[PDB]
């Protein structure tokens, strides 16, 4: 029997891009976005325009 | 299954004709570089379903 699909939180590498607004965090975390309609999501892909 | 694959499959020929684009524009005067950015897709289940 199948008791789950489940997610391995572990960390990457790092991979310098040389932009401005790019973030990386190095443990735990998450960043904090807030959607139209007033959800709040948690992420970590950090690339963001302005 | 098949479709799983063959997202990503198509996902990796876009990066390939931005990356082209550029290499062929390298020699002009006021060209601005093109980059692709991806993102996942999730159904109400939890696999997930490709690129």
Same mark, same amino acid.
């Given at each position: 029997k199948v008791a789950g699909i489940t997610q391995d939180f572990t960390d990457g590498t790092t991979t310098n891009? $040389?932009? $401005?607004?790019d973030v990386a965090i190095s443990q735990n975390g998450f960043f904090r976005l807030v959607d139209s309609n007033g959800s709040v999501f948690y992420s970590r892909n950090g690339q963001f325009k302005l | 299954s098949f479709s799983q694959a063959v997202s990503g499959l198509n996902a990796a020929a876009t990066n390939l004709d931005v990356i082209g684009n550029n290499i062929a524009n390298?020699?002009?005067?006021g060209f601005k570089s093109g980059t692709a950015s991806f993102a996942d897709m999730f159904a109400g289940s939890k696999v997930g379903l490709g690129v």
């Open positions: 891009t $040389g932009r $401005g607004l | 390298s020699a002009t005067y």
